[PDB]
């Protein structure tokens, strides 16, 4: 089947649009979903090959029930709120995700405008974030972000639904969380203390050894193995965002996975901890203010809608 | 003397930072002004020649008197609110302008972060806009934006203070207005109707001929001839901005001129109207929610 | 398995369309050149890779085929079918060999055209030569974005590549060329809104007109074909602007590839002869076809094995 | 104070050379186009800045000057001087206006040429139109690097722009154009070493032959000129490859700018009429001039102030 | 399933070739780095993407294989076979580990080389370190385009990657390295025509000499090899210029990847021992091999899983 | 006058060639000097505009006397060896400098090859360094290198000989030193400790406050004010180089100045120290193994021989 552009080339700009569908908004939404590929072509084609404009469209659990009368993707459910001893992963409203990426913010904005034009009156905006690449693929904590993402066949194997849910093959599960950083608290750490928090060297992005990597580092808690001892993997495209005047320095977290169980296991280790880690130290400097789970179906699922 | 980067090469990204100096914030502000060129080099240098990072720093009339003793720039005064028959050009608070431009937002955001971090607790944010290049130098109305800006020597005679105010030579006057657009109304016009509002053909960016250019087109009202019959010019770097969710479709207007009078003449013709023109038809689709005037000194002045 | 020619090229800014006839006795020279044309393409192109994007798709006409080769022929290979509509005519013009040369740069196309024609000197007569150039944001001389609804990836291969329906010629394709000249003065007399009604898409934003407003005689309405099984019948186009300002020649070089000529020829019949609902494609009221040729572009190994 | 036209252009990979004659009574229309030509350059080009690099250098012939303007003539303006050499002829061909249009892309050149001709259609007759393209690593149709010894910076400004010697026309220049067609068959018949003896430079490495080896009838030998003070007399060239493979047209469009036409004309006399040591420039044994025209390209403000 | 190393790399302008031997007791340190080398590639390369194009292909010699790994050996892995020809010798020199590091920039190559050699310090003895740079037009130190006839796509995969014939090692390849020093004074004494007869291609145009013209002792004649089924036997090369102007060192670092070492060895036999028609490859009259090593470059996941 | 490309656009790649002129090599060198700009165009023009190929040609004090009749440049003299309490700036032989830069090492190598092709048997190689910039203009110590270089008119003012020595106007003075780093010792410091050595922040390249910048930091000691109480500036294009096998991790230092006195004062502060600093902390991790001074004349001086 034909996947949406979950595996995107390198992109320097992104818009995350999360909306809820208003009472009676379903027909307008279905019409828009049947045209969303066509609208990405209308905005993007003229700018190819360099524009690299794509939209990954996601649908929430409750939205799915409202929109489609047939089978549901096997792993689709509302985002699971996590109430950890110190940190909380909040569950916030979100029926439709538009994960818009390009080499330029103008292409993202132009597509977001077309999509919201078609949806005006049928949806209510919940979140809008304009993400930007920050230096050499760094995030707002100044660490390279995306290093250990799977690539090529491993990325497709990690992200794209297959024979386990054949009606939904080539779909994926997207988890979003908007994080705001305490940059005063962070900049109070030495680089070495920051490296102990993340689990990688700051300037050179080399993973700390097994012997020095803390158990409560971000890398330690988000490194997960299945029972066969193979790494369980997700595909992240985290995007810096913010407003200097309001002291908002953010990471917009997005992780794609073939099943949400992997992303949810990483989140549990982060927020609830383990026997050797109280919680992910990154959360002592990062507050999640959104949390939503969406299924991003195969492109042909959206194209074939009435 | 050496100007700030008022005459910047074209940039695809910008941050417009307007702040008020809090009571007691003067010394922190003067120390930052000392270092703003150094912070620009610190953030920008390593981004090669492609980064094109610059910050143009401007000081408002009220701020000037709080910050500096002695002579004031000849043309420095607060933004003049225009109460037109239909359209208003509001005057809004602004002591400091940071006009940050680069080929990338990150360079703009990183330099904005350095500047605001130094001023934290000395200033109150008034406005912050993250501008992006829109297609082939187009604006939110879908028209090419910058076409008739002066270049080279003509740009320097238009924007840079010279012998007429010797102690402020190499400075400029910046006027900013944040505009929000009625895109629903605008998209209601035929392309031909839109071309009559702007005064240029939409796709080809060809100026309408004298015989068909409406007197209340944007181009007609912002074309000003001086005492000698030559064009009085300004240098604009207008930037699209917005939020699709809140239906904010924005033009951040910034015009630089040797003297505020040229920019002020254009605003009066636009908002107050003329014998031949009720007002600039662009204002039937564009609302000004800020208006501020700044003097952007010579680089040497800031130290 | 059979290696296709580069029918599916990444986007290219420059093209040379070279159409020649094979002179009496020229067949042996042509066969030698056909066995070397892939080798010449590597000679010119390799040093400019990866950005050069140089390729040549070689096509052979119906009459030329029978002059060059013995035994089985491509199932759909026939001379271009002249269409005499009530208003507009699609002429058939001579053409035995097509070289469809594309690159990121005209020089690579020019150099390869020179190598090919140097090998065919004394064996072929020039019929048509057009040097195409990208025109702003993938626009044509009518000022509309051209290529937006092309199929991509697997859908593109399915549309253009001969397969099991003609297995001896699997990996080949059918190219239809028509050199069009536009009446720009006539076109510029129409409002943008009237032009959008002719094409069926919005001019600046390239958004397809809604089903309620798209005219039945619009280009997009008449070149949108659904098969009896309900699926879209697709072709892959690489239309190239060309012209001469002094001669007031403003053209579209139309090239369309399809796994059978039937799809392309259906679109042509609808355009030139119209339907129940449309006298003819309104684009032809501003566009004159001055050439018409059909070629079979065989699998690369067919040409190499000669 | 005088603003030159873009005589000294950055390197541009595309050009259009448009030479036209002014019809009887076409003067008023041409004067209006000259007063608008910079505004049309901005209309087409500004949207593509900074990478587009679109410029038009507008040139006026000797006869055309007298039809269009009263007051002073530029000091060096006269019709191109036909050279009738013992073997080779530099023909004088009609041309009243030159538009030398350059950009990083042909589309911009073509769009600007289209706007200019749209204004002049009823007032002028096209005489020559050439679409030039960069060929490999700044090479010409003879396979040699072309432009190497051009002056740059201050030296170029001093060699090209009218100053104190003609104060009313300061910031102008003199353009000599010649369209050359090459006998590529004959050229490729030479060894690389024989080609190097014709040009005066090493072919692949572009290293100038030493004084002891450089033939006196080499191109470099005859187009190397010294003034009375003994310093080099220089022109600024922007020669552009062009051609048509089917018509076997392999062209160099020669254009040379000089502060006075006398430097360019001495080079032409040495090439075509030869010296004590050289019958003629050996490049002419492989190159035939089919046009020859001389233009004054005035300061931009001279054209604006019409 | 199996993940090949970046044997099939995008064209790269920079390379570092590192050959080391494993000291007494160096096995554990080496295995640890082998398990980390992909991780270190990402640490250095990710933050430089997508322009960086950093990769490292890691090879293991025959002797080193038995020191490091339990279980099966690759079926074709053996020490480099010295060829003592009538005139020229293919020397064998020591090498346990190969790091074939490539990127768009030498500084990225050097950063990865640093990390690898930092981990190996005290466990290995450096044998050879070459910093390769390609010329503008994929041209080598002899001034010929180098890579033209490399296979691409499926044919490259077919030629290079171990498949069903040795299934435990599928996705691996065999690397042969030879560092060549050129006699540039002797080479530059030849005419271009004479140099073309040595290589078997035209120097400027990179057009292959016809079978009737290509000398039997030409580099292209002797390295063109057919199977027992008449099909081409191919290898994938990425030869890099290197050297030192002070020391008058002008080199080609040869690296050839093949599914079996037998194809590369057949080519080396033809070059150094000649045929019935050729004493030896004329390229060796200007090129001396000073190193020779054979390595197995396993599937990436073989090294990852140590 | 036409300066050489001393004020170059940023370049990723460099070759530094230092040679001595053999006995009887003067005429061959003179011929090469008269052609070196011609050769730079030969290799560089067809690579434009992205190639950014230039060569700056420098002549040492002793060689000037062997090569030229006429006036000597005012400031030209042998590099002065500095014997500090801890660190030494060695003086090493050098008659000709070829400072070759481009976006690509192949362009540098092609030009170095044509230059050394012409000088074969007239000169002896002393140093050859192939330099590579890290991305973001970072050096072998991981720091952005070039940040406070003067630009535009300020750079012209700091670098080019003017009316002070009008027969050599458009010239400049190049000091070279090849530094080998102790990378193991360097990578032992915290980022914070390295920032105290350099005097700038590592990731953000923001200069340390006056209140925290150590007096023995590299920025503090290479920051010079003249009598006027205004900045004495040089123009640097330092290039990482090395060899992983030999554990050679280097910075090739090159500084251009209108007069050598400015560069030499910086070297005196670095190596001999001040009232408030024993020596430049950068020298605790950097050993100079070469040191030479050249005059890089106006291009037209070399052309007109
Ligand atoms: C404040 C929010 C976050 C920030 C700033 C952040 C930043 C980073 C950084 C700097 C790395 C190391 C480089 C890399 O491999 O990408 C990393 C790795 C990773 N992060 Fe995050 N991250 C955040 C949230 C999350 C969340 C919520 C999850 C999962 C639900 C997650 C999953 C991962 C994974 C799986 C890795 C790779 C670990 C490995 O296999 O080495 N991250 N992140
Ligand atoms: C909603 C706000 C604005 C928008 C969208 C806008 C857009 C444009 C456009 C599309 C053009 C034509 C192309 C060009 O030459 O740049 C233009 C021209 C111009 N605008 Fe604006 N503009 C705005 C506000 C202003 C304001 C407030 C001023 C002056 C105070 C101004 C002064 C000019 C001038 C001087 C020109 C050049 C006219 C000429 O000489 O042809 N604009 N503007
Ligand atoms: C005569 C000059 C022609 C011009 C200027 C032209 C131009 C265009 C334009 C502007 C579009 C809409 C954008 C797109 O999807 O590409 C389009 C679409 C199309 N054209 Fe053409 N066209 C021409 C001739 C033809 C011919 C002769 C055919 C078929 C034989 C054809 C087949 C198509 C198809 C299939 C589409 C896509 C329609 C859809 O599925 O939405 N065109 N063309
Ligand atoms: C007919 C086709 C022409 C071709 C193919 C051609 C080609 C070349 C080439 C390959 C060079 C050497 C590299 C360089 O640009 O410096 C050159 C140099 C030159 N050409 Fe031409 N040229 C032609 C006609 C002309 C004409 C008609 C003139 C003068 C009226 C001219 C004047 C020059 C000059 C002045 C030089 C520089 C010589 C020097 O100082 O080294 N060329 N040309
Ligand atoms: C001095 C060392 C070498 C140099 C400078 C060199 C250079 C070249 C050049 C210029 C080509 C022509 C363009 C191309 O197809 O890549 C070529 C082709 C080739 N070289 Fe080499 N080569 C060298 C050593 C070797 C060695 C040692 C082998 C094999 C063990 C080899 C195998 C080949 C092969 C197979 C081809 C392609 C021939 C074909 O099928 O057309 N080369 N080489
Ligand atoms: Mg017409």
PDB file of N, CA and C in Angstrom, chain B residues 34-94:
ATOM      1  N   UNK B  34      26.184  48.342  23.648  1.00  0.00           N
ATOM      2  CA  UNK B  34      27.666  48.243  23.519  1.00  0.00           C
ATOM      3  C   UNK B  34      28.046  46.938  22.831  1.00  0.00           C
ATOM      4  N   UNK B  35      27.280  45.874  23.070  1.00  0.00           N
ATOM      5  CA  UNK B  35      27.677  44.487  22.726  1.00  0.00           C
ATOM      6  C   UNK B  35      26.843  43.940  21.562  1.00  0.00           C
ATOM      7  N   UNK B  36      25.841  44.670  21.069  1.00  0.00           N
ATOM      8  CA  UNK B  36      24.895  44.069  20.084  1.00  0.00           C
ATOM      9  C   UNK B  36      25.672  43.685  18.799  1.00  0.00           C
ATOM     10  N   UNK B  37      26.637  44.481  18.330  1.00  0.00           N
ATOM     11  CA  UNK B  37      27.469  44.110  17.151  1.00  0.00           C
ATOM     12  C   UNK B  37      28.271  42.823  17.452  1.00  0.00           C
ATOM     13  N   UNK B  38      28.776  42.673  18.679  1.00  0.00           N
ATOM     14  CA  UNK B  38      29.597  41.497  19.098  1.00  0.00           C
ATOM     15  C   UNK B  38      28.723  40.254  19.175  1.00  0.00           C
ATOM     16  N   UNK B  39      27.493  40.412  19.633  1.00  0.00           N
ATOM     17  CA  UNK B  39      26.559  39.269  19.732  1.00  0.00           C
ATOM     18  C   UNK B  39      26.186  38.842  18.315  1.00  0.00           C
ATOM     19  N   UNK B  40      26.011  39.806  17.425  1.00  0.00           N
ATOM     20  CA  UNK B  40      25.673  39.544  16.005  1.00  0.00           C
ATOM     21  C   UNK B  40      26.789  38.677  15.409  1.00  0.00           C
ATOM     22  N   UNK B  41      28.069  39.017  15.649  1.00  0.00           N
ATOM     23  CA  UNK B  41      29.246  38.258  15.138  1.00  0.00           C
ATOM     24  C   UNK B  41      29.269  36.883  15.793  1.00  0.00           C
ATOM     25  N   UNK B  42      29.002  36.810  17.101  1.00  0.00           N
ATOM     26  CA  UNK B  42      29.078  35.573  17.914  1.00  0.00           C
ATOM     27  C   UNK B  42      28.107  34.547  17.344  1.00  0.00           C
ATOM     28  N   UNK B  43      26.883  34.979  17.047  1.00  0.00           N
ATOM     29  CA  UNK B  43      25.813  34.061  16.577  1.00  0.00           C
ATOM     30  C   UNK B  43      26.025  33.802  15.089  1.00  0.00           C
ATOM     31  N   UNK B  44      26.431  34.824  14.347  1.00  0.00           N
ATOM     32  CA  UNK B  44      26.336  34.822  12.875  1.00  0.00           C
ATOM     33  C   UNK B  44      27.584  34.271  12.223  1.00  0.00           C
ATOM     34  N   UNK B  45      28.754  34.519  12.808  1.00  0.00           N
ATOM     35  CA  UNK B  45      30.041  34.406  12.081  1.00  0.00           C
ATOM     36  C   UNK B  45      30.161  33.010  11.477  1.00  0.00           C
ATOM     37  N   UNK B  46      29.901  32.020  12.318  1.00  0.00           N
ATOM     38  CA  UNK B  46      30.127  30.596  12.011  1.00  0.00           C
ATOM     39  C   UNK B  46      29.156  30.124  10.926  1.00  0.00           C
ATOM     40  N   UNK B  47      28.009  30.796  10.760  1.00  0.00           N
ATOM     41  CA  UNK B  47      27.038  30.546   9.662  1.00  0.00           C
ATOM     42  C   UNK B  47      27.546  31.193   8.363  1.00  0.00           C
ATOM     43  N   UNK B  48      28.867  31.178   8.154  1.00  0.00           N
ATOM     44  CA  UNK B  48      29.514  31.145   6.808  1.00  0.00           C
ATOM     45  C   UNK B  48      29.288  32.518   6.187  1.00  0.00           C
ATOM     46  N   UNK B  49      29.232  32.654   4.834  1.00  0.00           N
ATOM     47  CA  UNK B  49      28.589  33.812   4.206  1.00  0.00           C
ATOM     48  C   UNK B  49      27.089  33.640   3.882  1.00  0.00           C
ATOM     49  N   UNK B  50      26.531  32.424   3.946  1.00  0.00           N
ATOM     50  CA  UNK B  50      25.103  32.162   3.592  1.00  0.00           C
ATOM     51  C   UNK B  50      24.148  32.631   4.707  1.00  0.00           C
ATOM     52  N   UNK B  51      24.596  32.723   5.969  1.00  0.00           N
ATOM     53  CA  UNK B  51      23.730  33.062   7.125  1.00  0.00           C
ATOM     54  C   UNK B  51      23.099  34.432   6.978  1.00  0.00           C
ATOM     55  N   UNK B  52      23.898  35.416   6.562  1.00  0.00           N
ATOM     56  CA  UNK B  52      23.488  36.816   6.315  1.00  0.00           C
ATOM     57  C   UNK B  52      22.780  37.367   7.563  1.00  0.00           C
ATOM     58  N   UNK B  53      23.180  36.919   8.754  1.00  0.00           N
ATOM     59  CA  UNK B  53      22.601  37.397  10.028  1.00  0.00           C
ATOM     60  C   UNK B  53      22.999  38.850  10.249  1.00  0.00           C
ATOM     61  N   UNK B  54      22.015  39.688  10.544  1.00  0.00           N
ATOM     62  CA  UNK B  54      22.241  41.084  10.955  1.00  0.00           C
ATOM     63  C   UNK B  54      21.160  41.422  11.963  1.00  0.00           C
ATOM     64  N   UNK B  55      21.490  42.358  12.829  1.00  0.00           N
ATOM     65  CA  UNK B  55      20.524  43.017  13.731  1.00  0.00           C
ATOM     66  C   UNK B  55      20.652  44.513  13.506  1.00  0.00           C
ATOM     67  N   UNK B  56      19.572  45.183  13.106  1.00  0.00           N
ATOM     68  CA  UNK B  56      19.522  46.671  13.114  1.00  0.00           C
ATOM     69  C   UNK B  56      18.788  47.101  14.383  1.00  0.00           C
ATOM     70  N   UNK B  57      19.477  47.867  15.207  1.00  0.00           N
ATOM     71  CA  UNK B  57      18.977  48.298  16.524  1.00  0.00           C
ATOM     72  C   UNK B  57      18.508  49.743  16.411  1.00  0.00           C
ATOM     73  N   UNK B  58      17.272  49.984  16.853  1.00  0.00           N
ATOM     74  CA  UNK B  58      16.658  51.313  16.807  1.00  0.00           C
ATOM     75  C   UNK B  58      16.211  51.719  18.193  1.00  0.00           C
ATOM     76  N   UNK B  59      16.238  53.021  18.434  1.00  0.00           N
ATOM     77  CA  UNK B  59      15.872  53.675  19.721  1.00  0.00           C
ATOM     78  C   UNK B  59      14.779  54.701  19.453  1.00  0.00           C
ATOM     79  N   UNK B  60      13.684  54.618  20.215  1.00  0.00           N
ATOM     80  CA  UNK B  60      12.534  55.528  20.086  1.00  0.00           C
ATOM     81  C   UNK B  60      12.846  56.874  20.678  1.00  0.00           C
ATOM     82  N   UNK B  61      12.008  57.870  20.379  1.00  0.00           N
ATOM     83  CA  UNK B  61      12.174  59.282  20.823  1.00  0.00           C
ATOM     84  C   UNK B  61      12.198  59.364  22.361  1.00  0.00           C
ATOM     85  N   UNK B  62      11.231  58.760  23.043  1.00  0.00           N
ATOM     86  CA  UNK B  62      11.138  58.846  24.537  1.00  0.00           C
ATOM     87  C   UNK B  62      12.341  58.126  25.162  1.00  0.00           C
ATOM     88  N   UNK B  63      12.712  56.973  24.607  1.00  0.00           N
ATOM     89  CA  UNK B  63      13.873  56.182  25.053  1.00  0.00           C
ATOM     90  C   UNK B  63      15.161  56.988  24.905  1.00  0.00           C
ATOM     91  N   UNK B  64      15.293  57.749  23.809  1.00  0.00           N
ATOM     92  CA  UNK B  64      16.532  58.500  23.485  1.00  0.00           C
ATOM     93  C   UNK B  64      16.854  59.389  24.685  1.00  0.00           C
ATOM     94  N   UNK B  65      15.860  60.127  25.185  1.00  0.00           N
ATOM     95  CA  UNK B  65      16.037  61.161  26.241  1.00  0.00           C
ATOM     96  C   UNK B  65      16.429  60.478  27.554  1.00  0.00           C
ATOM     97  N   UNK B  66      15.880  59.298  27.836  1.00  0.00           N
ATOM     98  CA  UNK B  66      16.247  58.464  29.017  1.00  0.00           C
ATOM     99  C   UNK B  66      17.675  57.913  28.924  1.00  0.00           C
ATOM    100  N   UNK B  67      18.189  57.635  27.718  1.00  0.00           N
ATOM    101  CA  UNK B  67      19.454  56.878  27.488  1.00  0.00           C
ATOM    102  C   UNK B  67      20.657  57.797  27.260  1.00  0.00           C
ATOM    103  N   UNK B  68      20.462  58.953  26.619  1.00  0.00           N
ATOM    104  CA  UNK B  68      21.573  59.807  26.119  1.00  0.00           C
ATOM    105  C   UNK B  68      21.308  61.273  26.448  1.00  0.00           C
ATOM    106  N   UNK B  69      22.334  61.959  26.946  1.00  0.00           N
ATOM    107  CA  UNK B  69      22.407  63.439  27.050  1.00  0.00           C
ATOM    108  C   UNK B  69      22.897  63.984  25.705  1.00  0.00           C
ATOM    109  N   UNK B  70      22.799  65.297  25.513  1.00  0.00           N
ATOM    110  CA  UNK B  70      23.320  65.976  24.316  1.00  0.00           C
ATOM    111  C   UNK B  70      22.336  65.914  23.160  1.00  0.00           C
ATOM    112  N   UNK B  71      22.827  66.222  21.957  1.00  0.00           N
ATOM    113  CA  UNK B  71      22.057  66.314  20.697  1.00  0.00           C
ATOM    114  C   UNK B  71      21.200  65.057  20.486  1.00  0.00           C
ATOM    115  N   UNK B  72      19.996  65.278  19.959  1.00  0.00           N
ATOM    116  CA  UNK B  72      19.058  64.231  19.474  1.00  0.00           C
ATOM    117  C   UNK B  72      19.111  64.206  17.949  1.00  0.00           C
ATOM    118  N   UNK B  73      18.872  63.050  17.290  1.00  0.00           N
ATOM    119  CA  UNK B  73      18.666  63.038  15.843  1.00  0.00           C
ATOM    120  C   UNK B  73      17.570  64.048  15.464  1.00  0.00           C
ATOM    121  N   UNK B  74      17.843  64.880  14.458  1.00  0.00           N
ATOM    122  CA  UNK B  74      16.966  65.981  13.993  1.00  0.00           C
ATOM    123  C   UNK B  74      15.514  65.507  13.796  1.00  0.00           C
ATOM    124  N   UNK B  75      15.280  64.284  13.310  1.00  0.00           N
ATOM    125  CA  UNK B  75      13.924  63.864  12.912  1.00  0.00           C
ATOM    126  C   UNK B  75      13.271  62.965  13.931  1.00  0.00           C
ATOM    127  N   UNK B  76      13.917  62.729  15.071  1.00  0.00           N
ATOM    128  CA  UNK B  76      13.395  61.711  16.010  1.00  0.00           C
ATOM    129  C   UNK B  76      12.242  62.336  16.799  1.00  0.00           C
ATOM    130  N   UNK B  77      11.082  61.701  16.719  1.00  0.00           N
ATOM    131  CA  UNK B  77       9.862  62.031  17.481  1.00  0.00           C
ATOM    132  C   UNK B  77       9.058  60.742  17.538  1.00  0.00           C
ATOM    133  N   UNK B  78       8.082  60.667  18.462  1.00  0.00           N
ATOM    134  CA  UNK B  78       7.208  59.507  18.544  1.00  0.00           C
ATOM    135  C   UNK B  78       6.371  59.377  17.265  1.00  0.00           C
ATOM    136  N   UNK B  79       6.042  58.130  16.926  1.00  0.00           N
ATOM    137  CA  UNK B  79       5.144  57.789  15.804  1.00  0.00           C
ATOM    138  C   UNK B  79       3.876  58.642  15.905  1.00  0.00           C
ATOM    139  N   UNK B  80       3.482  59.282  14.805  1.00  0.00           N
ATOM    140  CA  UNK B  80       2.302  60.184  14.765  1.00  0.00           C
ATOM    141  C   UNK B  80       1.067  59.332  14.447  1.00  0.00           C
ATOM    142  N   UNK B  81       0.165  59.166  15.408  1.00  0.00           N
ATOM    143  CA  UNK B  81      -1.116  58.458  15.180  1.00  0.00           C
ATOM    144  C   UNK B  81      -1.890  59.201  14.085  1.00  0.00           C
ATOM    145  N   UNK B  82      -2.373  58.480  13.067  1.00  0.00           N
ATOM    146  CA  UNK B  82      -3.226  59.023  11.979  1.00  0.00           C
ATOM    147  C   UNK B  82      -4.655  58.505  12.165  1.00  0.00           C
ATOM    148  N   UNK B  83      -5.576  59.428  12.423  1.00  0.00           N
ATOM    149  CA  UNK B  83      -7.031  59.162  12.558  1.00  0.00           C
ATOM    150  C   UNK B  83      -7.670  59.541  11.220  1.00  0.00           C
ATOM    151  N   UNK B  84      -7.663  58.616  10.254  1.00  0.00           N
ATOM    152  CA  UNK B  84      -8.276  58.851   8.935  1.00  0.00           C
ATOM    153  C   UNK B  84      -9.797  58.841   9.031  1.00  0.00           C
ATOM    154  N   UNK B  85     -10.516  59.340   8.005  1.00  0.00           N
ATOM    155  CA  UNK B  85     -11.971  59.225   7.961  1.00  0.00           C
ATOM    156  C   UNK B  85     -12.490  57.792   8.175  1.00  0.00           C
ATOM    157  N   UNK B  86     -11.716  56.783   7.757  1.00  0.00           N
ATOM    158  CA  UNK B  86     -12.115  55.348   7.749  1.00  0.00           C
ATOM    159  C   UNK B  86     -11.057  54.532   8.496  1.00  0.00           C
ATOM    160  N   UNK B  87      -9.775  54.768   8.188  1.00  0.00           N
ATOM    161  CA  UNK B  87      -8.645  53.935   8.664  1.00  0.00           C
ATOM    162  C   UNK B  87      -7.760  54.717   9.642  1.00  0.00           C
ATOM    163  N   UNK B  88      -7.279  54.015  10.658  1.00  0.00           N
ATOM    164  CA  UNK B  88      -6.437  54.568  11.738  1.00  0.00           C
ATOM    165  C   UNK B  88      -5.040  53.935  11.630  1.00  0.00           C
ATOM    166  N   UNK B  89      -3.991  54.758  11.669  1.00  0.00           N
ATOM    167  CA  UNK B  89      -2.591  54.328  11.917  1.00  0.00           C
ATOM    168  C   UNK B  89      -2.282  54.604  13.393  1.00  0.00           C
ATOM    169  N   UNK B  90      -2.460  53.590  14.234  1.00  0.00           N
ATOM    170  CA  UNK B  90      -2.215  53.690  15.703  1.00  0.00           C
ATOM    171  C   UNK B  90      -0.720  53.869  15.996  1.00  0.00           C
ATOM    172  N   UNK B  91      -0.418  54.622  17.054  1.00  0.00           N
ATOM    173  CA  UNK B  91       0.913  54.762  17.674  1.00  0.00           C
ATOM    174  C   UNK B  91       0.985  53.839  18.887  1.00  0.00           C
ATOM    175  N   UNK B  92       1.934  52.920  18.942  1.00  0.00           N
ATOM    176  CA  UNK B  92       1.973  51.916  20.036  1.00  0.00           C
ATOM    177  C   UNK B  92       3.324  52.029  20.727  1.00  0.00           C
ATOM    178  N   UNK B  93       3.439  51.567  21.984  1.00  0.00           N
ATOM    179  CA  UNK B  93       4.670  51.766  22.739  1.00  0.00           C
ATOM    180  C   UNK B  93       5.835  51.020  22.071  1.00  0.00           C
ATOM    181  N   UNK B  94       7.013  51.635  22.066  1.00  0.00           N
ATOM    182  CA  UNK B  94       8.259  51.001  21.612  1.00  0.00           C
ATOM    183  C   UNK B  94       9.446  51.867  21.935  1.00  0.00           C
TER     184      UNK B  94
END
